[PDB]
Structures are given as C-alpha cells and as structure tokens.
C-alpha cells in the first residue's frame, strides 16, 4: 500500500534527534538574518530582506516583520508562507484571549501556544514541520518588555538580545560583546544595524534591503506604540548612525 | 398519533416451595374487548431450570423472553457451559429491562 512512500517525518534518529526538525533548522540558517534587542525603555526588531531586486516594490511589502496585535510583533526567518499560517493562528489566539478575559494576552502565553502547535507537528500527524523561526517582541503589564524565540522543534526561550536565520554565530558574538543592561532604545537601534552591517552577505547595507520596527513606551503617558518603519524612515536612521 | 404500547391482558402467578417452584399463567390473549387466542402460552422454559413469564404488552413480553433465552445461550458459550443460577438470571434481566428505562418494556416479569 502507501507505507512504501511514507518519509516518517516524526521519528527519532539513533542518536535521539528529530531528523526533520534538524533539517528545517538547516533551511532557516540560509534565510535573511533577523535581530531582536531588548532595552529598558523599549525593543528593537531588525531584519535583512533576502537578495532584493531593483524592481521590487519596497514600500508596500511585508516579508520579515509582522504585527500580531497592538502590543506584540514578530520577526520571521524561514519560509514566509509557513510563517503566515502560524501568524494568522497567533492573531486569532490573541483575540480569543481578549474576548475571554477582556485583557490583552500576556506575551509568553501567546508564544507558548504557538510553540505547542509546532511541537505537535514533530510528535504526531506524519506531516513536515513548519520551516520557521520567530523572534517575538512584545509588552505586557506583568513582565514589561520581552524578547522570545521559537523554532521548528517547538522549543522557546527568552532573550535580552538574539539573532535568527543566517550568520547567527557571528551575530550573537557581536551582540554579546557590545550589549549592556542599562541600554536605551536609540542605542539598541544603532547596535542592531551595526551587527547586520558586519554579518551581512551583501556588499553594503542599504535602506531597500531592510525591515525595521520598534516597540517603545514613547507614546503619551503609560502606553505602548508599535512603529513599523517606512522606507524613508529606514533611510534616515541609516544616515543618522553613519552607515551610509 | 401512533401509540407504540398495547394491553394483551392475562395474569400470572409464581409460588416457591421447599424443594420446588411453580410459575402459572392463563392462556388467554386479548385486545380491548376481543379474544385473540384461547391458547397462547406466556410461561416459557428458558433452560437451566429457569421458567419465565413477562405479562402485559405481549410484543414486549415476547421480545424480552427471546432476549433472555438468547442471554442464557451466550452465557454457556462465554463461560464454559456453566449453569446460570436463578440469582444471576435475575440480575441479567434487570439490565435488559433497565437498558430500556426511557422506552420501557410494558411488562411485569416473573421468573
């Protein structure tokens, strides 16, 4: 029968590893680098677009940075199509929580549930896992500003600064060097861009090959604002830090 | 509207002695003011020295007896031809009757 053609996506290797999870991570390692940096007064999300063409419409485009609700955003590394399936699920889960409790969802709860979905694809169903790693940037009134990452295994962890996708080894070393705990948002913006500028496989880092976003309390009095940067705004912040 | 029950009349009577027991019943079967049969038995030998009668609505009575006789048969198959004791038969019949708690067998049963 059909047994002949089954790849057996949810099995262990002799060494105790999940083949498909490991290979999905190998896929993600070729995706455009995404960096998250958490400051005391906000969070930065920076991501490098995958080898841009000059005729690509840059202003009305969304590849890396997605909004889950007013308080939580994600940076994507891997298959965009796979990520959008998970994003719409996460968007729904956040609204279910709000409908139930009349409170915005805590960041970790949203992360855990999205990670539990990924876990399911590695243990049952016989389907391939999602070839996606997320950086979650968000705020709630319990823990304040939070950075998380999840990967195809369904395992998630919290971070002060983190990178996913390509050149994470090099990127993480640079972040580990220059990061400190009393850091401000504007400093974190500069660190994020400087790190990408050194780890990039491109010749020079330009505005058209970047997506950028911040989550500050820079609105008026005790409230959070999400700023998905426009092309011209990325151009200005790139000049202001002295990269171009 | 359709009424699924009926009354077939008749009456039954069980008495126990020291080393014996009797189960008697009249042989008349009726509907309303008409006689259907002057000789229609409703006291049956079910095997294992158990006699049974289910008097009231004859359709339900026959169905129950038929199910119990079948229960005795499968008791032999599943438990190495063991004799079904009268107390065990009684309990088995309870489950037959209570299984239709919300659409009852309209009968008064005696074994």
């Amino acid at each position: 029968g059909s047994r002949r053609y089954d790849s057996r996506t949810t099995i262990f290797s002799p060494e105790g590893r999940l083949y498909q999870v490991e290979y999905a991570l190998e896929s993600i390692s070729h995706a455009g680098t995404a960096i998250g940096i958490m400051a005391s007064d906000g969070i930065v999300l920076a991501a490098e677009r995958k080898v841009t063409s000059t005729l690509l419409e840059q202003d009305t485009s969304t590849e890396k940075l997605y909004k889950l609700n007013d308080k939580i955003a994600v940076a994507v590394a891997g298959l965009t199509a796979d990520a959008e399936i998970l994003i719409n699920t996460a968007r729904i889960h956040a609204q279910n929580y709000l409908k139930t409790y009349n409170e915005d969802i805590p960041v970790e709860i949203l992360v855990r549930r999205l990670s539990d979905i990924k876990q399911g694809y590695t243990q049952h169903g016989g389907l391939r896992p999602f070839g996606v790693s997320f950086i979650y940037a968000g705020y709630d009134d319990r823990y304040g500003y939070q950075l998380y990452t999840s990967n195809p295994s369904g395992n998630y962890t919290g971070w002060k600064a983190i990178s996913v996708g390509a050149n994470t080894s090099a990127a993480q070393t640079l972040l580990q060097m220059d990061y400190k705990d009393d850091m401000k948002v504007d400093d974190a913006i500069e660190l994020a861009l400087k790190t990408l500028s050194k780890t990039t496989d491109s010749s020079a880092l330009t505005y058209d090959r970047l997506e950028f976003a911040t989550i500050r309390k820079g609105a008026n009095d005790g409230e959070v604002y999400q700023k998905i940067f426009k092309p011209q705004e990325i151009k200005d912040i790139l000049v202001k830090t002295g990269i171009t | 509207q359709f009424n699924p029950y009926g009354d077939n009349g008749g009456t039954i009577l069980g008495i126990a002695g020291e080393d014996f027991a009797v189960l008697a019943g009249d042989t008349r079967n009726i509907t309303d003011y008409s006689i259907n049969s002057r000789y229609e038995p409703k006291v049956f030998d079910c095997g294992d020295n158990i006699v049974m009668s289910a008097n009231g609505f004859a359709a339900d009575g026959d169905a129950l007896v038929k199910r119990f006789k079948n229960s005795v048969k499968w008791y032999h198959f599943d438990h190495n031809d063991k004799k079904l004791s009268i107390n065990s038969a009684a309990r088995n019949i309870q489950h037959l009757l209570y299984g239709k708690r919300f659409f009852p067998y309209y009968v008064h049963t005696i074994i």
Partner: protein, 231 residues
C-alpha cells in the same frame, strides 16, 4: 520474495504469498480429522500441549445445537471465526426461526476470509477449520481454508501429517459412509483414521478430543474420561 510484503500484492505467476504463508500455519498445527455417515457427523482432534505441566489446547468449538467445528493453526483466529458463525447461526434462529444450513455457514466463512485477502492493512486468517453439522438435508462435513476456499466432503483431515488420515479415509470411504444409526462405530472409524497420523506419541485420555452431531444427537464434545472408551 518482493511480492510477499502484504496481501494486496500479486506475484508475477499470480500467487498471493501472504495467503500461502497463512496456509503454512495450518500445516504446523496439530492434526484433526472429520468424517460423516448419512445419520451422523464426527470430529476427532489430536490436542497439543506446551509441556507435561501444561493443559492440552482445546481444538473443538460449538457453534449451535446442530453445528460446530475443529481448528488447526492460530487458535485466536478460530475464536474470531467461530464467534462469527455463532452470530450467523443465531441471526438465522432469531429472525427466521430457521436452523442455519451447513452449506450457507461455509459460504459466509468464505466471504469473511476473502475480504481480508483483497484489502491493504489487514491480514489473512491463519487457521483452517473442519465444520460438521446436521440440518434439513442430513449430515454434512466442510473444510475451510483461509484463502476462502470451502469444500464439502464425506471425510477429510488437516494439520501436521494429515495425509496419513486422509489416505485412510479415502480407502475406508465405502465402509464408514454406511455406518448409519451407530455413533460409537463411526467414532471408532474416526479414531482409527487419526491414528494413521501419529508418530512416536499415542492416544491418551487427556490427549484425545471427540465431537459428534446427528439425527437425534445435539452437537456435544467428549474429553477426559469420556473418551477412554475409544482408546
């Protein structure tokens, strides 16, 4: 070789190897004999034990008051198939107030075994059965094989070294067929038939298993001291 992974695959010569491997399980099973006259039908079964401390595996199963079988091969598969026969015999009684014909009993078993040989996932039954019975057309004996093939016979035998008993019955055909109105003599012929399949071992009191059905005889099984008469 490459065509024996499952029952859904034909070989290049048109063979079903999983069915043939199921057939092989019967040959490994202990010997059992079936034979009939015009008035009675008899099953004789050599029971097998694990060791001297163990009991002897029961080979004969009752299906109704007028029908039953003996088994050879996987015993749990015989339990499934005998249970199905009990239900079919019982359905015929409750619905039609009719004792199930031994021929229809065979037809139903054939069709049940067949479905397992044409579908993916399932497997063939790993047991052979000898069904005896007395119905409206007299005494009957059937031979069931898990390929689906059912065959009505005067006498037969299945299991290990069954060829010895089968040859004897082929010679004795004219004699035992006319043992009418005599149960003990028909059994004697069956006990002598199964004895042709014995090697080193002989028929003892807790080893032999006999069953009989007939005109004025319900299907009844004899074990233990009840078969001491026929040794």
């Amino acid at each position: 070789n490459n065509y024996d992974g499952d029952t859904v695959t034909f070989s290049p010569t048109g063979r079903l190897f999983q069915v043939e491997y199921a057939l092989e399980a019967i040959k490994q099973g202990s010997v059992t004999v079936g034979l009939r006259s015009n008035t009675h039908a008899v099953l004789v079964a050599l029971k097998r034990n694990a060791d001297e401390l163990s009991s002897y595996q029961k080979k004969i199963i009752k299906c109704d008051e007028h029908m039953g079988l003996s088994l050879a091969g996987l015993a749990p598969d015989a339990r499934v198939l005998s249970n199905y026969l009990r239900q079919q015999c019982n359905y015929s009684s409750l619905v039609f107030n009719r004792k199930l014909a031994v021929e229809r009993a065979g037809h139903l078993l054939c069709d049940k075994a067949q479905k397992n040989t044409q579908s993916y996932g399932g497997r063939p039954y790993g047991v052979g059965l000898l069904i005896i019975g007395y119905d409206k057309s007299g005494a009957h004996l059937l031979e069931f094989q898990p390929s689906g093939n059912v065959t009505e016979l005067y006498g037969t035998a299945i299991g290990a070294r069954s060829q010895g008993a089968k040859t004897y019955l082929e010679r004795t055909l004219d004699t035992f067929i006319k043992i009418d109105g005599n149960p003990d003599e028909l059994i004697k012929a069956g006990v002598e038939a199964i004895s042709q399949s014995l090697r080193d071992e002989s028929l003892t009191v807790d080893n032999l298993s006999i069953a009989i059905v007939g005109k004025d005889t319900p299907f009844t099984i004899y074990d233990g001291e009840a078969v001491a008469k026929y040794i």
